[PDB]
Amino acid sequence: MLLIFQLALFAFIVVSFLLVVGVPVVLATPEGWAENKGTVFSGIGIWFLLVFLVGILNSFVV
Amino acid sequence: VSRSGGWLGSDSQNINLDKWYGPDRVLYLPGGLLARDEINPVLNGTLPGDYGYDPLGLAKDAETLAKYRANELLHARWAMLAAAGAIIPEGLAANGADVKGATWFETGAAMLNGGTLNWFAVPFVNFNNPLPLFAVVAINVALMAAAENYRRTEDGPAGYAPGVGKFDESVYSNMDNLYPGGPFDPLGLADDPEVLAELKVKEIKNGRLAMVSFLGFAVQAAVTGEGPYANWSKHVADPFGYNLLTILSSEDRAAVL
Amino acid sequence: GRDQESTGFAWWAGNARLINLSGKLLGAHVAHAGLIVFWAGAMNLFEVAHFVPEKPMYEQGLILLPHLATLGYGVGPGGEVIDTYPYFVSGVLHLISSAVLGFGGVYHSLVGPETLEESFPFFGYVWKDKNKMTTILGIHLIVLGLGAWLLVWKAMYFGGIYDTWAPGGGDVRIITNPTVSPGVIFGYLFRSPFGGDGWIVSVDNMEDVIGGHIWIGTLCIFGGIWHILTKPWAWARRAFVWSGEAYLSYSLGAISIMGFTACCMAWFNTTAYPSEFYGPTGPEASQSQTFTFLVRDQRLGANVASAQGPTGLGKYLMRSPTGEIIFGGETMRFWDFRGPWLEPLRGPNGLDLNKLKNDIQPWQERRAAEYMTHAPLGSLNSVGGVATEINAVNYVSPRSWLATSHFCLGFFFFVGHLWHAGRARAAAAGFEKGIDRDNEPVLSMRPL
Amino acid sequence: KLPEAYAPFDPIVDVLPVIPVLFLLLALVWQASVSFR
Amino acid sequence: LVDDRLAGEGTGKILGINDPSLFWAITIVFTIVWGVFYVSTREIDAASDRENDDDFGLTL
Amino acid sequence: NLEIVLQLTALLFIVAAGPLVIVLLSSRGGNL
Amino acid sequence: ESTSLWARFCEWVTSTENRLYIGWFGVLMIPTLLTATSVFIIAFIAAPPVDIDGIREPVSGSLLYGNNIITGAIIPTSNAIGLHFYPIWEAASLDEWLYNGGPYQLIVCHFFLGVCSYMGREWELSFRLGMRPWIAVAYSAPVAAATAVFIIYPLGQGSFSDGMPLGISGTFNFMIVFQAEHNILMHPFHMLGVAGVFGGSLFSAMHGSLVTSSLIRETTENESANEGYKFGQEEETYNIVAAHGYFGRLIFQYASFNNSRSLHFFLAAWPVVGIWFTALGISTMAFNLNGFNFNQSVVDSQGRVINTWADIINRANLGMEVMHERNAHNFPLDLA
Amino acid sequence: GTTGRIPLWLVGTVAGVAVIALVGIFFYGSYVGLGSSL
Amino acid sequence: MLTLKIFVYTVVTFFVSLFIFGFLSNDPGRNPGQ
């Protein structure tokens, strides 16, 4: 599970980087919070899912 | 004169139905995330606890919403009785009371092989309930089948309830399929229309809390193999040492250092 | 945002444009909160990664891990780190929590409501509304009280707190009898700040530490309920400036005091800041030197009690100006120091001569020897030792970093009181922008 | 050190604590972009 | 011993009160100053020309 | 030297993530 | 109008018609500063020698005991006292209080309250006169420096004997020992402090010379140029554009302040910020966070240490270290 | 030819980063090689 | 020395009490502006 866990952590880091830059850009963009608001929630939801996935996988790997 | 009033002195009764009913009813997402025009139109704020929450578009018309609300209220009321009844007897046994079959998912086995159960009229004396398993199965099924059929057919036998005294079959007519009132409201707390609307909101909200709670009781039973009280007592005893992650670990985690 | 054309504040005073924009001001405070939680998480993981078990905590430049250790995480008896996994989850939990805190800061700042007074009356406020201001003061006063109760719950029900004075050696201990006596609590609060007294920096039991946090937790909750159900009285209404900048200056003056107190806590206290994790204090290291030379010279053969120094005072042992037998030399100033390794040798009258020459345990000698070499002396570039030392040891005590930094923060935030409180009065009076050319007050006064 | 499972990610942790000081500079470069309006 | 002294130094006494007479010194003085202040509050506020209602005090 | 190479690489992203936001908003005519 | 005693007292206290403003900070400033002034003058003239190091070796600091104005000083409290509170009533006799350095604590404690109240009194008069309230902020810089050498440095070191003596030669002993133990010259904050006072001295000379160079002709040569200015003038007494033109050509056009308000803020900020950091420097060095230590930083290929100017400083620091408090140290490390 | 101007704030940002990088290298060199006491 | 201590406690309390109740006497209202 070590390889699976590290892939999930790496995916969590990548999606966090996308949110770090993506979220302020769409928020500052006037149309962004009206139209891209749908895809932001998907990013937030995926980010939280990886948080819990990495959290449970930590138990089986540490 | 009124049968309803405030709880904190004169002019302490402030029932705001606007927050739970109408256009400004609270929603499952805040104002800045979900616009009120994005809510399913069938959810117009006339039913208790209409948080405007229905992804997957399950309710597509008033009839479908009414049919499902009949299911939701029943699943909710049963869960409220179950949530309370699944953990209260176990809490008694853990504190020293003589209860046989404390955990809810082990009470059935206690009645096997001719064993009986002790019913605790908690404020007062306990009981060595003599009903055997065959009898309990027969009586419970007969009473429940009869009770549900009366609800299904919306008609029942004449009888006595304290709020209405002695009633005949006529009272069953003109009773809401979900909020019968009448004999089912002996204390008459449904008299005030504003109070009744607010109390309906509290019913499903406590009911929805109970349904999710019993779901946890079941999932927790499968995972930790203990009763819900045992899970709570040991989370509170050692929170970081006893939670989901520690159980999933299932091994003596080597010190990192 | 805004600009100087419509606000009158330049870019370097740009955050002053948020004084009456409650919604954006909320996001500003939530975003800085996310930064604080981010730093706590990031610095925690940084210290855990750079942690080597072959050295003590204070030799590795760690200032956050000692705070976790004093709470009794991953420490065995004697201040030995047994497991750093609890330190890891602390860093991760803060780091992840900063993300959601950061999102709310960015949301409430960039795209949320500018002013909450219209859409959200519960959260909306105007600085002039003394009643509404007290409710916010009352509400956040309760959460502070609850935070204090978390400490006592940790010390009494959840594992316990590391006690450096514990019988049998320093260890994580459950506090079962917190000291909640009014005389003890009031004794610390209204004690002198001078030597021997040390105000509240002299709390020397975990019973008194968590006994005090029981009082603080209770007072803050009652004060929270009080300030929620009451509006300020007439005497207060005629004593304070009721402006947003005025409320800020009150807090700046308050946390300036808290900054100075934390500076003295990290420098003198050995209970809430165990020497096992933060290293020896200034007094402790000086006291350890004479103890080390007393022990080693006894083996060479010498009566330490009868030994004279060049000045005629006791070379190893002398009397304090109150009569207690103390260590000699320059460390005579630090005679009020008390430490877990030194109290066993101290009787009612001071250091016991018999115990000093018959019953000095090896662990006591090792503690004093270690504390002397790790004295809180170092350079800016972290060269251990006095200024007249070679570049050999890379060490500065965490007490030096904690005391030195939080004094600079304490002083600058005192200048914050002076600045933001002066401006608060002038702006309210209405002359923060200058003297009226046609209505100069001095021109209407009798000449001196 | 970190747990063995988190070892490959150690270099990221080694640069994390300097991020908060970048926000101060980020505010400065943000104001420069808008010509310090 | 050879001389007499208060011997209260470094003893952690509340407000430095070694003897109860110091308590009376502080209490009496504070009460007097508070006494003359208390009977003058209305006059001082009257100068403001406003009544000390819930909207009284320097406010921006 | 793989450690320092990875540290500089990670440092390169974060010191660029901030300015990346500003330039994207400036280029796209954002409300910055 | 006011009839109440307190109403009349509070009007007198806050009255701006007094020759010297009292205010509420003045009811704290005046008694504390007069108390410290009285004991200082009496002690500087007639105080007995003080056992500063706690080693029963009294140090004479009074004029009547053989000192002149330069060498006279109020000796700090005894090292035996430490940080302990030593009021005159905690001493068996006033002779014992004098012997142990009592007057130093009385002066320092009342003086610290005086400067803090003097700072507040500066704010109070500004509020009473309707001017902007930040002269007190500029005064916080010297207050911090005074607080650092009289309170914070003794606090961190553990004894009031390590405070600055209240004398001229006593001040020099404070600086020399400070260099030997902390290497203050190599600390970036004394460096900022030096830039604060060298720069402040430079800016004072430049601003004074530039304004004097631009005085508009309003007098003859048999009169002082000062006579050209009348107290209360509504017009400017010197040409700011002319002064900016001179300094603009002196270095280059954009190195000069065209704005008198920006110029005067710079004249205030530069020394105040500089003194803030050097005050912090002493405060940080109170907790033994010494200046830069570059001793034996340069070594050759085979390991031989090549000396630098920093090592020569260490040689001087070594000499002061082994001579200060000659009889006070029984053990090799100067941890106190 | 190609019409355009480099934004001034971008020039300051890149120059500011380069200066910070240069100072960082000097502080890095303070701990390694010559003058590091090592 | 106690007599001296009580005298100083009386004096220090007197000036501190004036300072405390002085600023409680509608101090913010004592300004030349309107």
Ligand code: CLA
């Ligand atoms: C002091 C912090 C604070 C305060 C006072 C407010 C206040 C407000 N928020 Mg906001 N918010 C915050 C933080 C805060 N928020 C954070 C951290 C986030 C990121 C999750 C958000 C995200 C957010 C959104 C998306 C929206 C608001 C909105 C609002 C407005 C009302 C509706 C609402 O409550 O929505 C938010 C409700 C929740 C976030 C539910 C959270 C569940 C509980 C309250 C969490 C409590 C957990 C616990 C106490 C936290 C521990 C402390 C922690 C720091 C460790 C209101 C004025 C709405 C608005 O502005 O309308 C236009 C809106 O759409 N907020």
Ligand code: CLA
């Ligand atoms: C803790 C520091 C801090 C915080 C929280 C704020 C917060 C705020 N400032 Mg401010 N400011 C600061 C420091 C700070 N400032 C400093 C140091 C200066 C001096 C240079 C200024 C000077 C200043 C001025 C001149 C102004 C503000 C203004 C504002 C407000 C609106 C800004 C805006 O909408 O423009 C938009 C900004 C952008 C579009 C660029 C930033 C994009 C995001 C936020 C960058 C962060 C990305 C982040 C990593 C994403 C992760 C979040 C999540 C996905 C995990 C806002 C509440 C304005 C105001 O007053 O409102 C009226 C304004 O006029 N500030």
Ligand SMILES: CC1=C(/C=C/C(C)=C/C=C/C(C)=C/C=C/C=C(C)/C=C/C=C(C)/C=C/C2=C(C)CCCC2(C)C)C(C)(C)CCC1
């Ligand atoms: C408003 C505004 C401002 C500010 C802002 C801010 C301040 C923000 C913040 C923000 C934030 C505060 C953010 C945060 C974030 C975080 C995150 C996103 C996290 C992440 C994490 C991860 C990704 C993972 C990690 C890990 C673990 C899990 C374990 C170990 C390993 C590792 C480390 C890998 C400014 C100035 C610009 C100006 C303008 C306006």
Ligand SMILES: CC1=C(/C=C/C(C)=C/C=C/C(C)=C/C=C/C=C(C)/C=C/C=C(C)/C=C/C2=C(C)CCCC2(C)C)C(C)(C)CCC1
């Ligand atoms: C946790 C983590 C994360 C996150 C991160 C972050 C949150 C970041 C951010 C960051 C940032 C926040 C950045 C920014 C920075 C800034 C900059 C880089 C800038 C600078 C500037 C300069 C240098 C210049 C300035 C100036 C101007 C232009 C004007 C004039 C003056 C001067 C020139 C000075 C990640 C994703 C990694 C994942 C993993 C984990």
Ligand SMILES: CC1=C(/C=C/C(C)=C\C=C\C(C)=C\C=C/C=C(C)\C=C\C=C(C)\C=C\C2=C(C)CCCC2(C)C)C(C)(C)CCC1
């Ligand atoms: C936790 C703990 C503890 C403690 C506790 C407590 C209980 C605390 C408290 C404290 C308190 C309980 C209090 C304090 C403080 C307060 C203050 C410091 C302030 C005052 C202020 C002010 C500001 C005044 C003012 C005035 C008035 C009258 C009004 C106007 C005018 C004037 C401004 C003049 C102990 C020690 C055991 C240790 C361990 C831990």
Ligand SMILES: [Cl-]
């Ligand atoms: Cl000397």
Ligand SMILES: [Cl-]
């Ligand atoms: Cl020594």
